[PDB]
Design a protein around this ligand. Structure first.
Ligand code: HEC
Ligand code: HEC
Lengths: 53, 218, 52
């Protein structure tokens, strides 16, 4: 499955803690070598991760 | 059933009415309303010994299948998540165990390890309450506790986490703690601070004893 | 695609080529696993074969 999937507002709870990352739809899913490397690059970013409470 | 549930919850006034009301209304001074949580919340909070206190784990109060009655009573009062049961009238024990481990381990290190520990031991929080060790945890209560959202713990919905994800998580949890450490005696699963304590208390003492034995004092 | 199949007519009476095992079950170089399989096929000392 894709390393990252889109997020819906209904899919949360009153006390839910989740971790999200930028998607940039032009990236695409992890099928080709370039897309996989770009997904790994966005994964390895110090200032990328963001909480949504 | 339902009448027996009322007997064991309300007529057994030792347990319910003194903190939440006969109609499960919830006295604002002491406890919550307790009207929207399902039978799973009661099952987890009762079967793990987190009974009314004066709240660390203790011995359970109700064990003789009346926990099912309490869960039926609370679910009839209000809807919510229910206990996953084996397809024979009992509670699932090994059917909940999954197969994948890498995804489960990654999910553990992404959301579980933060509070509890890297290896599932106790964790340290701020201002009193802490993170209990997962060693005395049993898989059904693990899943139910995640789905329930107990005190100070983020509540997790089945919508955001797949059922296969729960199976993988519990499989990884059971594998990590129950497997023998292939490095000799374990040192609590913490960082190098106990390692340094052990060096100072054993290596130093034996070394200076051998030095005194070999050497002479004058 | 890193490798393509071979036809008898696509040669010459004095031409030489370099070929490698294909093993179509691996697939083309699109997915990561297929890419690694093709590369490890390419990374083999006793693999290359000369057809004249
Ligand atoms: C005041 C003494 C006290 C009594 C009596 C008591 N509890 Fe609690 N329990 C608490 C308090 C206070 C909370 C609120 C959250 C907390 O403190 O963890 C709680 C939390 C809970 C929770 C989890 C939080 C939630 O919102 O559901 C459940 C489930 C629960 N109680 C059920 C019960 C059941 C079932 C009984 C009867 C066996 C019972 N309580 C009797 C102290 C009590
Ligand atoms: C610090 C925030 C926090 C996070 C993050 C967290 N927990 Fe909890 N959890 C707690 C606290 C606090 C308790 C104990 C509350 C109590 O005993 O009343 C607990 C209880 C538990 C228990 C019950 C142990 C027992 O003996 O009853 C288990 C199992 C558990 N957590 C595992 C997990 C899992 C799985 C996750 C990932 C979904 C997780 N922890 C993430 C706070 C957290």
């Amino acid at each position: 499955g894709p390393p990252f999937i889109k997020m819906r507002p209904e899919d949360m709870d009153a006390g839910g803690m989740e971790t999200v990352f930028p998607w940039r739809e032009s990236d695409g899913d992890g099928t080709t070598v370039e897309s996989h490397h770009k997904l790994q690059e966005i994964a390895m970013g110090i200032r990328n991760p963001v909480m949504l409470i | 059933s339902s009448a027996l549930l009322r007997t064991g919850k309300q007529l057994f006034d030792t347990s319910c009415v003194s903190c939440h009301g006969a109609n499960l209304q919830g006295v604002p001074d002491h406890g919550p309303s307790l009207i929207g949580v399902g039978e799973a919340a009661v099952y987890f909070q009762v079967s793990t010994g987190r009974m009314p206190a004066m709240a660390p784990r203790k011995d359970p109060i109700f064990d003789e299948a009346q926990i099912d009655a309490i869960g039926a009573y609370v679910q009839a009062n209000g809807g919510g998540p229910t206990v996953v049961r084996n397809p024979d009238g009992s509670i699932a024990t090994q059917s909940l165990r999954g197969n994948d481990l890498g995804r489960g381990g990654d999910l553990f290190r992404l959301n579980c390890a933060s509070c509890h520990n890297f290896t599932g031991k106790g964790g340290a929080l701020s201002s009193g309450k802490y993170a209990p060790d997962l060693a005395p945890a049993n898989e059904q209560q693990i899943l139910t506790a995640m789905l329930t959202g107990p005190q100070n713990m983020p509540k997790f919905s089945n919508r955001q986490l797949s059922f296969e994800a729960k199976k993988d998580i519990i499989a990884y949890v059971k594998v990590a703690t129950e497997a023998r450490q292939p490095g000799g005696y374990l040192l609590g699963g913490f960082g190098p601070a106990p390692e340094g304590m052990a060096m100072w208390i054993i290596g130093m003492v034996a070394a200076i004893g051998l030095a005194l034995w070999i050497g002479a004092r004058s």
